[PDB]
Symmetry: D2
């Protein structure tokens, strides 16, 4: 049959945004994880949405669960180009499962055959059409995408065990002592929060869930386990649909929970061969295309040139000489003279005063680094002034600088 082209059209994807899980702030001091700046020009949610477009699912519902203005604004500036008459749109649904139930009437209006539940706070490339094919072929009422993960990390994920037909036999949510994969147990088998539902089953099921007082109203914590025990939950190996230029590589998926994970994932793009390919013309990522002037590199006050090693400089940046290494500079970052920026991620509109030395850190949006501030060299002092991760990564939010008496306007 010609089902592959048909299934996306019969499907609707819902992206559960909101639920901030990041220390980073975006100019009002309380951002949501889905709207976190990434890779110089992107926000995390862009990935999920982008996948939908490239997968053939042009009907999306972004659920923003705390009236966030930066996420709504991003959807409005970068994802409001659709012609509703062509069966394509990005609806902004107001306020994990509870939010979906709250908008259940509006969703039924979509009149969708299959529903794609996604988490808009992960960075990955996946062809959802393949997962829909697997859904129909395997014929479950619910299909869940899964992948092997290190045992140490498995506590944050939902762990599952399947049979020969990839039918979900056992599921447990963020267990403290996660089961290892039965065979080749170098790591437990974690779920990716990516679901495909037959629309009718999901509607009925959410109706059932809202009336239970004791249910936690979460897919992983309450809903999915109930789905699993009835034997209607099948598994989808992520490699079956994961999109990647180099076939001989591990599937790329980052939940970007910790500061260290964020710092690592961003700096990856500055390396010679990044694990994540952001140049792939066959699976592009859509975002708000801000009009920015070219990156401007100028001489410092001493008239010296600037040096750069394995770094990214987004539009609107202005760099006076200085040395920038293993760093990612988002849009409109100003770096004044005699700076040493080092293994750092500077979010948009950061202003770095002269004679600064930044190292293994993440400067938050619009921070104003005063003149001659040093970061990343004295562990105790840095931990005192700002936040320092267990591995040694520093986070500098503009509020932290305010507490130290440095005006950020």
């Amino acid at each position: 049959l010609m089902l592959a082209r048909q299934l996306p059209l019969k499907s609707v994807a819902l992206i559960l945004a909101g639920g901030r899980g990041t220390r980073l702030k975006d100019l009002t001091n309380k951002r949501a994880k889905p709207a976190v700046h990434f890779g110089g020009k992107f926000r995390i949610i862009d990935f999920a949405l982008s996948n939908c477009i490239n997968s053939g699912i042009r009907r999306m519902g972004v659920i923003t669960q705390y009236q966030s203005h930066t996420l709504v604004q991003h959807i409005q500036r970068g994802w409001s180009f659709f012609n509703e008459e062509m069966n394509e749109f990005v609806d902004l649904l107001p306020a994990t499962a509870d939010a979906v139930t709250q908008n259940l009437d509006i969703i039924r209006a979509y009149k969708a055959e299959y529903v794609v539940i996604l988490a808009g706070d992960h960075i990955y490339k996946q062809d959802y059409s393949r997962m829909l094919i697997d859904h129909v072929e395997k014929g479950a009422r619910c299909t869940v995408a899964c992948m092997p993960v290190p045992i140490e990390e498995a506590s944050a994920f939902g762990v599952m065990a399947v049979d020969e037909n990839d039918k979900i036999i056992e599921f447990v949510e963020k267990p403290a002592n996660p089961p290892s994969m039965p065979n080749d147990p170098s790591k437990s088998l974690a779920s990716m929060g990516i679901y495909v539902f037959d629309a009718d089953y999901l509607y009925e099921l959410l109706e059932e869930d809202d009336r239970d007082e004791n249910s936690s109203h979460d897919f992983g914590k309450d809903l999915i386990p109930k789905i699993t025990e009835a034997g209607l939950a099948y598994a989808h190996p992520f490699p079956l649909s994961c999109v990647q230029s180099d076939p001989d590589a591990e599937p790329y998926w980052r939940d970007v929970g910790t500061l260290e994970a964020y710092w690592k994932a961003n700096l990856d793009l500055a390396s010679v061969v990044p694990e994540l390919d952001m140049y792939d013309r066959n699976w592009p990522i859509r975002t708000y295309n801000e009009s920015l002037p070219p990156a401007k590199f100028v001489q410092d006050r001493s008239g010296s040139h600037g040096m750069t090693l394995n770094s990214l400089v987004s539009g609107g940046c202005v760099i006076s000489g200085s040395v920038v290494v293993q760093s990612v500079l988002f849009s409109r970052v100003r770096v004044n003279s005699f700076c040493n920026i080092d293994s750092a991620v500077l979010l948009p509109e950061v202003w770095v005063g002269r004679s600064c030395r930044l190292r293994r850190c993440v400067i938050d949006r619009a921070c104003v680094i005063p003149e001659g501030m040093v970061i990343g060299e004295n562990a105790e002092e840095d931990a005192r002034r700002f936040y320092r991760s267990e591995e040694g990564i520093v986070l500098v939010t503009r509020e932290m600088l305010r507490k130290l008496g440095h005006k950020q306007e």
Copy 2:
């Protein structure tokens, strides 16, 4: 008063093109962007781009970056196909439907910032049927321009188009009073003039402007009255970018520490096609050494492996491989610079593939043989030139 904002709404701007208007400039722009942008910032949201010839790149640029208007709100960018006035006469039927009280004739092949609303005020206040924007230019060059002589009330006493003996200004002999090819017309008067003129040159300057002057209905508009500039204590910025040297000079100006042209002005922004590009990527060379950048621009999508980039402007997606020394150069989009190249005082055209170890800008004679070399010493490198030398473009 209410006149100031309402005059723009009753006006329509026509941008005559040719392709020069579709020339890359400043890393992310095309020249026409300025003219159009001025209109937007001046309150004129109804534009008519007359393409001398249907240029695929110009039509495409207008389609990708300037086709965002809601026609029901009295805003549009019409693509009108086509002497200079003859092109307007051809689309005269379409233009009448605009139902504009005033028509703004612009040249889409110049780089400048001008508030056309001020020129409209000056036009109405003076009550002329036609107003011409004028700026002093060196007398030596005035032969290329249309020159004018005015009275105390900025009324044009005399006009001559491209005169062999350009008149000097009575009170500033070093230069003359030049017309900028920027006009404001009473729409109905323009219609009458075009109808009468077709039944006859077919150029505004050579034919129409002298006729209007003879009727005493042609007034002048000093450019400083409306020119937009960050530093008031400076000469008005207007570059025709005709010659290679002018193009190279204007582009590299944007790379200097203090450019004469402010491309960071949020009060008079320039609209263009907002390309979706990855950040400019700097990487290590084959030796693992760092790269050096001095007073240069690096647009999105570029990938630069170490090397030294000085006094240069790199447009989008320019690839610069290891061990390169680029100095006072302008690299247009999609240029591919092979390893170990040394480019100096040159302009590399779109998508050139520079092979490995080519040197340019050091041996004048050799450069002149391979490519085009201006009298002042600037080199231009096209895809065709490179094919003549046997270097595959693919």
Copy 3:
């Protein structure tokens, strides 16, 4: 000094938006939603920076702004921000602005234009900005004479020879009359122009005071007046209208009768409100709809139409449509008599229906042979019937009567 061109660009407009669909998001005139007017005015006045403050985050309002008012290129200093508000006797009008005060400060505007997005009118805010500056006021309030009987609902003001506000009172029970004509009062239109800095300071001061109700009219305007910094702006100075002689058009549309009246107004031969004015157009969501399709009824008979509007996607089998407005995708089956009615989108009228002086809500399914508008007592039982005689029919009402809505 070429002020008119500059002031809008230095200004930002704030549109305050207070069962399911919110008042600013009420369908109107076949294709529009009320808020469209306010926004449109801003656009036509030169103010391309707007902030829609939604007290109740209506999915239909956000969705409408998303489909029809998210076409701006932010790099040119133009946008429509969706500002949420998180919710005493008087609704806290100012509180909603106070909540988003940080974002608004980020605009860095010299002047702020406060608007009510639940009124239908055409006004050139640039004229009010010029007058604002000329008077040198810190606050200018748009004012219009209104019938005194109704004036109790409005905020009433008394001005001097220089249009400076001398006295202000919100919703007086015993409304003061105007000196010239005491059958009218001088009412505030809930349209303000503020010096940005002054507004910021005033909101900061107001949020601290517990006594204040955080409403523009009851507390803020009196405070400004007592300082002698509140000037008035005659609406005719800026009201935009095709016919210079007619009276300024401004409709509150709170009452059901007001909605029915305003909608039906567009169906008359000469409506008071000109929706064909190419010089002051109204922007809205341009839905792709097929042309209005008129077909024969089951008997093969023609349809009759008198002073009515038929929006795109409608399908009418014969029937008689009089003094009515049919929104998009309305199906009217055979042998129907529609009279002085307003049918919101996707209404389905079964065969042999007779509707009169009524309002059918979105997507209602009228069964076959239902009569409305003729038996006052029965209509009042079945649905909602206003004191003046107008009927409203919602999907739920038809549900309770045993008629499937699906």
Copy 4:
């Protein structure tokens, strides 16, 4: 293979060719169908070869310039027999880097799922696939006629033969080419390069390239029913060329009938066009205060009708109809102004016509034929020049 969806994404559509920019069905322009088909088939990369024709460029600009180029979707305006036009721009087309090329004619009205034709193309392993439809033998001479074997491989092709070969399945019909081709991109490029580079052919697919492919045995046929989209499966495939005036009039009026052959309400295969902001269709009283009558007719946005009688008619956007008018089996294109007391029958009024007061059309056959063009079958066409020679002022 596993997933068919990828074939469209690997393809680019080229729409050749004033005809494509003709108003149809009240709101659409003909080209809208082709383009729309591409969209609904998964082909979001189109190249419209124009000329320039201002109306076509403008339509593409207002209604088909909403694409995000970074997502591999666009409708670029390519300027320029038929194959020569593609050859002119094949530098740009090669830049597309498409695996398959879909050549379409933008002057036909039809609904077709090109993805199914791509499947058939690959499955048959053809270098070129030509969409084929039975046509009446009398009419088949204007078309390119072909003869195939059991495997739908094209055995014989002839362009516009005067003596069309008959077909076995329906002697009353022959096998006609629909001017819809699917090519392996590289192969197509090779054929164009060699033809412009060497052969002195007419540079037409049917006259030159299709025959060349057939003699090579690399040209297969694709039955239109395999991909034609229609709500009623038990119905005949819809495909109208609209060259003749009568065809235009008929196709337009079909949409006003109770059950149109062409479904313009299909939410599963919608047609995109320029969505102009128009006020609702306004019906008002005539000068006598009397009602208006309507029978099986369409009234687009912006129209204003004062009473009058409108029967079996299509009124495009912003048509003004004054009092005491009787319009019957007529198609009035946008912005027409009909004076008081007119009676129009079986005609097509062109854009922005101003019909003076009391003019009658469609009744006195001779009189109408005298005034302006009248087809042999009895349809009248009214153009603004026609009225100017009759002395009625336009441009008001």
